[PDB]
Enzyme design. Structure first.
Site, short mmCIF file in Angstrom:
data_model
loop_
_atom_site.label_atom_id
_atom_site.label_comp_id
_atom_site.label_asym_id
_atom_site.label_seq_id
_atom_site.Cartn_x
_atom_site.Cartn_y
_atom_site.Cartn_z
N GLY A 108 -0.68 5.05 11.25
CA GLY A 108 0.92 5.31 11.21
C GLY A 108 1.20 3.64 11.79
O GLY A 108 2.51 3.86 11.22
N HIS A 116 0.89 -0.96 -0.29
CA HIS A 116 -0.14 0.08 -0.26
C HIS A 116 0.42 1.34 0.39
O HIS A 116 0.41 2.09 -0.18
CB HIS A 116 -1.03 -0.14 1.15
CG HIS A 116 -1.89 0.90 1.03
ND1 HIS A 116 -2.93 0.43 -0.15
CD2 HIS A 116 -2.28 1.88 1.59
CE1 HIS A 116 -4.28 1.52 -0.16
NE2 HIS A 116 -3.45 1.72 1.44
N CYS A 120 0.57 1.05 10.28
CA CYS A 120 0.91 -0.25 8.68
C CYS A 120 2.30 -0.36 9.02
O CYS A 120 3.30 0.26 9.05
CB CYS A 120 0.31 0.45 7.84
SG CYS A 120 -0.39 -0.33 6.45
C1 LIG Z 1 -6.35 4.07 12.77
N1 LIG Z 1 -5.67 2.23 12.54
C2 LIG Z 1 -5.63 1.62 13.27
N2 LIG Z 1 -4.53 0.77 12.41
C3 LIG Z 1 -4.06 1.71 11.08
C4 LIG Z 1 -2.97 1.25 10.30
N3 LIG Z 1 -3.47 2.04 9.12
C5 LIG Z 1 -2.47 2.80 8.87
O1 LIG Z 1 -1.33 3.18 9.77
N4 LIG Z 1 -2.35 3.63 7.81
C6 LIG Z 1 -3.07 3.65 6.93
N5 LIG Z 1 -3.20 4.22 5.54
C7 LIG Z 1 -2.09 5.27 5.26
C8 LIG Z 1 -2.47 6.79 5.45
C9 LIG Z 1 -1.27 7.37 5.11
C10 LIG Z 1 -0.59 7.91 4.84
N6 LIG Z 1 0.07 9.05 4.78
C11 LIG Z 1 1.60 10.28 4.91
N7 LIG Z 1 0.60 7.43 4.52
C12 LIG Z 1 -0.31 6.59 4.67
C13 LIG Z 1 0.00 5.02 4.56
C14 LIG Z 1 -1.28 4.80 4.98
CL1 LIG Z 1 -0.73 2.87 5.46
N8 LIG Z 1 -4.49 2.45 7.01
C15 LIG Z 1 -5.50 2.41 6.31
C16 LIG Z 1 -4.99 1.58 4.91
C17 LIG Z 1 -4.00 0.51 5.47
C18 LIG Z 1 -3.74 -0.34 4.51
F1 LIG Z 1 -2.61 -1.29 3.72
C19 LIG Z 1 -4.68 -1.12 3.20
F2 LIG Z 1 -4.34 -1.75 2.86
C20 LIG Z 1 -5.99 -0.02 3.43
C21 LIG Z 1 -6.01 1.04 4.02
F3 LIG Z 1 -7.26 1.44 4.25
C22 LIG Z 1 -4.57 1.74 7.67
O2 LIG Z 1 -5.47 1.11 8.09
N9 LIG Z 1 -4.98 2.40 11.32
#
Ligand SMILES: Cn1cnc(Cn2c(=O)nc(Nc3cc4cn(C)nc4cc3Cl)n(Cc3cc(F)c(F)cc3F)c2=O)n1
Ligand SMILES: Cn1cnc(Cn2c(=O)nc(Nc3cc4cn(C)nc4cc3Cl)n(Cc3cc(F)c(F)cc3F)c2=O)n1
Lengths: 304, 304
Positions: free
Chosen positions: A143, A41, A145
C-alpha cells in the site's frame, strides 16, 4: 550534542498526499498545483501487473475511471497523460497547500527523507540514502506505492523519489518525479535483482568526523596515508573508491576538527583491517554510511 | 519489509512552534489555542541562569517584556502565569492551526518523536525513548530549548516532552507539558548528574521479534527459560527486570511469529552471554532497545 538519524520536517509534503484509485487498484499520489503525480502501475488490474502494456491500458481509460481523494474531498480528473513511469492526472482544483518545490534527481550516496503513506494517509517519516546499486533500504508495507522522498532547502521542497516496488531481497526501488527509474528496473510485478551493493566511503568518513566532534576519539592515530594506498585497501573491503572531490567535500569537517582527510583515512584503514573489538562509535558497532558530509554539518553545527 | 527508526509525521506540530524572547534570552514555545507554552528559563538574564529565583524574576516582568513571533507575525501577550517549570503566555490570537491534542506524561521505556526547533523554526524530526534514568539521548544544539516531543493517536497529538537542557554527559533533560521534570533535575544552569542507565528489556525483545518477522532467524534456539532464571541473568548485564505484564504486552508479536516470549527470552539469554560474534540483527551489531512493542507492530503490520 548527540547524533541521530534525523529527517526533515514533513508538514510541507503531508498536505500534498492524496489517494488514487483506478478500479480496484489503489495507491498514493502527489498533488501539486492542479496535477496529481502517481505511479502508472495504478492503471493495471491484477491480471495486467505481471506484464503490462501501459500504452494499451492507458488508451482504454477515461478521466472518470480515476478516483482521487484528498482526505474526504474528491478531486475531478479533467485530463491524464503518461510521462515515462509516472501518470499525470490533471484535476480541476489546484492544491492550495502547494509548497515551493522542484524535481531533482539525486546521486548514489545522497540522503533524503521519506514520507511513508498508506491510502493517501501520511504514516511515518525516516531518513535513508540512495545505495550505490540504486536501491534504498526503506521501511514499507503493502500500500505504500507512490510514497515520496524529498529534501528541504530553506523554503523549497526538492522531490527526488517516488516509491514503486519491493525487490525480492526486501530493498526498495523507485523513480524520480519525471518517471525515470533509479537503477535497471522496470515497473512490472516480476522478480528483478539488484547489483551488488558497496559501502559509501565518503559518508563513513563524514560520520567518523561527527564522532570526533562528539568526543569519540579512540580510533584516531598518527599515520597518514595517500589516496592510492587507501583506495587499494577500500576495494578489498567493498568500499567505493575515494576521489579528490570527496576529499574536498570533507573540507569543512577537516577544518572544524583539525584532522586532515588523509589522517582520518588512516584511521578508517585501521578500523577496516582490525575491526572495532567490541568498541562503539556514536553508539554504533558498525561503520555507518548513510550520513553525508552535509548531514553531519547540519546536525553538528546548525542549519534549519 | 525493512525496519527503520520511524518518527511520526510532524506537520501538525510544526504549525504550533513559535519563538519567545524576553530581553536578550530566546527559545522556542508551543502555541495552542490562545496560550503559548515555553520553559520558564526564558525570564532569566545571563546573570540569573545559575541560580534563578523564578518567583522574583516573574513579578518584575510585564506582558510587554515578552516578544512572541510566529514566523513574521508578532503575537500580543495579554497575560502570563507560571505552572511549575513552564510559563503560560496568554496571547490575543488563538492559533488557527491548533490540532486536537492532549498533555500526557510518558513512562521510561516509551518512545516519542521530537521536533527539534531553532528560533521558532522546525529543523528536523527523529524518534527516541525516555531512558530508565529519565534522560533522553537526543540530538540538540544551542537554541533548541522548548523543542517538543509527541506521539500521534489517530487524529490526536499527545505532547509528552518539552526540552529544557543538556547534561554534562551530553544527554538531555526536560519536563512534561505541565512543567514537571522527568527525573531529579531542576531548571538551572548547573552541572547535574543522571543516575546510571539500564537497558529496556521488553524493547529488546520487541526488536528480536521484528527481526524474526523480517527473516533474521539465526539467534533462535530450542530452549525455554522461566522469568526468574532470565531475570537472574538480565540483572548481571544491567537489563531492566522483566514482568508478567511485559510478557503480556509482547502477546501480539508472540502470536504473529509462533515463538513464545519465554522462548525468545532464552535466545536473549544466549546473546547476552555469548555476544553476537560479528553477526548482525536488522543491520545492527548491538541489541537495540529504543523500539517498543507498539513501534514494531506499527511498522511490521500496519497503522497510519
Ligand atoms: C511489501 N511492500 C513494500 N513496498 C511495497 C510497495 N508496493 C505496493 O504498495 N503495491 C504493489 N502492488 C500493488 C498491489 C495492489 C493491490 N491493490 C488493490 N492495489 C494495488 C496497488 C499496487 Cl501498486 N507493489 C508491487 C509493484 C508495484 C509497482 F508499482 C510495480 F511497478 C511493480 C510491482 F510489482 C509494491 O511493490 N510493498
Ligand atoms: C547544546 N545544547 C543541547 N541542548 C541544549 C538546550 N539548551 C538551550 O538551547 N539553551 C540553554 N540556555 C539558554 C541560553 C541562551 C542564550 N540566549 C541568548 N538565550 C538563551 C536561552 C537559553 Cl534556554 N540551555 C541551558 C539551560 C536551559 C534551561 F532551560 C535550564 F533550565 C538550564 C540550562 F542550563 C540548554 O540546555 N543546548
Amino acid at each position: 550534542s548527540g547524533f541521530r538519524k534525523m529527517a526533515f520536517p514533513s508538514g510541507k509534503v503531508e498536505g500534498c498526499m492524496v489517494q488514487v484509485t483506478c478500479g480496484t487498484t489503489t495507491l498514493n499520489g502527489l498533488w501539486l498545483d492542479d496535477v496529481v503525480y502517481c505511479p502508472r502501475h495504478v492503471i493495471c488490474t491484477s491480471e495486467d501487473m505481471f506484464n503490462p502494456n501501459y500504452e494499451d491500458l492507458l488508451i482504454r481509460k477515461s478521466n472518470h475511471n480515476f478516483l482521487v481523494q484528498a482526505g474526504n474531498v474528491q478531486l475531478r480528473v479533467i485530463g491524464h497523460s503518461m510521462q515515462n513511469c509516472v501518470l499525470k492526472l490533471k484535476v480541476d482544483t489546484a492544491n492550495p497547500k502547494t509548497p515551493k518545490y522542484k524535481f531533482v534527481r539525486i546521486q548514489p550516496g545522497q540522503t533524503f527523507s521519506v514520507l511513508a503513506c498508506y491510502n493517501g494517509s501520511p504514516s511515518g517519516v525516516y531518513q535513508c540514502a540512495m545505495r550505490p546499486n540504486f536501491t534504498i533500504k526503506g521501511s514499507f508495507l503493502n500500500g505504500s506505492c507512490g510514497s515520496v522522498g524529498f529534501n528541504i532547502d530553506y523554503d523549497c521542497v526538492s522531490f527526488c523519489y517516488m516509491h514503486h516496488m519491493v525487490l525480492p531481497t526486501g530493498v526498495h526501488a523507485g523513480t524520480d518525479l519525471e518517471g525515470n527509474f533509479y537503477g535497471p528496473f522496470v515497473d512490472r510485478q516480476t522478480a528483478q535483482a539488484a547489483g551488488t551493493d558497496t559501502t559509501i566511503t565518503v559518508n563513513v568518513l563524514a560520520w567518523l568526523y561527527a564522532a570526533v566532534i562528539n568526543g569519540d576519539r579512540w580510533f584516531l592515530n598518527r599515520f597518514t596515508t595517500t589516496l592510492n594506498d587507501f583506495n587499494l585497501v577500500a576495494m578489498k573491503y567493498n568500499y567505493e573508491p575515494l576521489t579528490q572531490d570527496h576529499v574536498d567535500i570533507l573540507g569543512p569537517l577537516s577544518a572544524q576538527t583539525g584532522i586532515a582527510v588523509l589522517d582520518m583515512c588512516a584511521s578508517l584503514k585501521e578500523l577496516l583491517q582490525n575491526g572495532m573489538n567490541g568498541r562503539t562509535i556514536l553508539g554504533s558497532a558498525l561503520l555507518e554510511d548513510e550520513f553525508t558530509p552535509f548531514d553531519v554539518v547540519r546536525q553538528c553545527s546548525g542549519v534549519t
